[PDB]
Amino acid sequence: QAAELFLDTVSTFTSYELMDYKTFVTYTVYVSMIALERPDLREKVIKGAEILEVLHSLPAVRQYLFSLYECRYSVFFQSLAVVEQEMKKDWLFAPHYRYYVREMRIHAYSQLLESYRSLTLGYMAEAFGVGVEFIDQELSRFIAAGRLHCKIDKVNEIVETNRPDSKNWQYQETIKKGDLLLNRVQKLSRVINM
Amino acid sequence: PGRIDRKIEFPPPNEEARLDILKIHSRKMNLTRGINLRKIAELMPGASGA
């Protein structure tokens, strides 16, 4: 919703509160890179001249956007650590800087990993980002986190993916909201009538 | 002269008094950032408010 309110970046103005228009540009790209998928990214932010000419003055942000779009995975963690570091030292993003990059990592892992089925784990250290045990414990906590749809083999050194349906995942949030609202109207149901 | 109490003249707008009508009237449009209404107010040589 935040990028959706940040949709225009055209009628937006040289503000009193974001006196840099380009800081508003950095904000809308930082929220857009999570908020929208490839089709949207591959038309909206990549072809906008009004969005292009303002990151034209940005050396890192133009790199940080194009390292993700142009499959430059290894430097993406470097610039990711930069923007995550400043975001850690940033007002209004310091409430959710850990929330940001835990979505960025699983987003890039979804991007590369949802291409092939038989890509091995040792392939990714040199072409993707260094640390075989880091990719080990990192994907292990994400499959263990119940996302990042694949299934890793260990003692033959290969990573296998699958594809799930839109059934049980879409079922899950329905039973979440059903139990949540059941708690709500149950609680209020005991609130009224003594 | 014992009839009318006050008579008030209405002049055509100058370059100042066209810019504010551009300001008020330009409110309900979906603009683009950077317009420079001063130039356009100079381009109109003061016809009337309509």
Side-chain angles (χ1 to χ4, degrees), chain A, chain B residues 1-14 17-50:
Chain A
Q1 294 299 109
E4 183 65 32
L5 270 299
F6 288 159
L7 193 277
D8 49 354
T9 71
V10 171
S11 65
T12 66
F13 62 102
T14 63
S15 178
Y16 63 95
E17 60 189 4
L18 293 179
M19 61 181 288
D20 192 7
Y21 184 77
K22 187 173 73 174
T23 51
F24 179 75
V25 173
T26 58
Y27 291 160
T28 188
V29 66
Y30 291 162
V31 70
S32 72
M33 58 180 69
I34 293 174
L36 48 85
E37 199 184 1
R38 298 296 299 278
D40 342 324
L41 196 150
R42 65 107 180 88
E43 191 273 334
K44 188 178 265 78
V45 297
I46 198 70
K47 301 293 180 68
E50 67 276 15
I51 203 66
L52 184 61
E53 293 174 354
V54 287
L55 57 86
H56 182 74
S57 176
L58 289 170
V61 180
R62 185 262 186 198
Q63 190 269 327
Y64 183 67
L65 199 278
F66 291 164
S67 182
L68 185 63
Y69 181 74
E70 295 294 326
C71 296
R72 295 180 180 178
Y73 295 100
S74 182
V75 64
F76 182 73
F77 290 102
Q78 296 297 110
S79 54
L80 176 142
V82 172
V83 177
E84 174 59 20
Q85 193 278 129
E86 183 180 0
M87 181 176 287
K88 182 191 262 76
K89 290 184 176 66
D90 193 3
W91 180 64
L92 200 274
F93 290 165
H96 56 85
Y97 64 96
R98 292 176 69 86
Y99 180 73
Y100 185 80
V101 158
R102 68 174 285 161
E103 185 64 29
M104 295 303 293
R105 294 189 183 97
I106 195 163
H107 182 73
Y109 297 161
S110 67
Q111 183 178 3
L112 185 143
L113 266 300
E114 291 294 329
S115 177
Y116 296 153
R117 63 99 179 265
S118 178
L119 187 62
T120 190
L121 59 95
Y123 181 79
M124 293 176 65
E126 69 278 13
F128 183 78
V130 293
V132 175
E133 69 276 16
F134 181 76
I135 299 168
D136 189 8
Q137 66 184 356
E138 190 71 28
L139 298 180
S140 179
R141 71 185 65 188
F142 287 165
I143 303 169
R147 296 179 65 188
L148 193 143
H149 297 285
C150 67
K151 181 59 68 68
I152 180 171
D153 289 327
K154 300 296 293 181
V155 294
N156 50 0
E157 199 267 328
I158 191 168
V159 175
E160 182 63 32
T161 195
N162 53 357
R163 77 284 299 147
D165 292 331
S166 296
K167 297 291 183 67
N168 295 116
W169 179 69
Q170 196 178 6
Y171 177 78
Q172 189 64 42
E173 58 184 0
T174 58
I175 203 66
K176 293 295 182 181
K177 300 296 182 182
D179 294 331
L180 189 146
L181 189 142
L182 185 144
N183 194 5
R184 178 66 64 194
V185 302
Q186 182 178 2
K187 180 176 72 175
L188 175 56
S189 177
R190 293 296 183 274
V191 167
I192 52 96
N193 197 2
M194 189 180 289
Chain B
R3 181 68 66 188
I4 304 300
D5 298 326
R6 186 176 293 175
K7 293 185 285 185
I8 296 169
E9 192 272 334
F10 289 157
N14 59 4
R18 292 188 298 275
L19 184 65
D20 53 352
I21 303 175
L22 289 171
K23 190 271 302 296
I24 299 168
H25 191 277
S26 64
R27 184 70 69 189
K28 73 277 191 184
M29 303 297 290
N30 190 4
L31 273 311
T32 310
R33 177 71 270 167
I35 182 165
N36 196 355
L37 291 171
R38 180 66 58 85
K39 297 298 293 298
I40 306 167
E42 294 175 354
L43 289 173
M44 292 181 287
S48 71

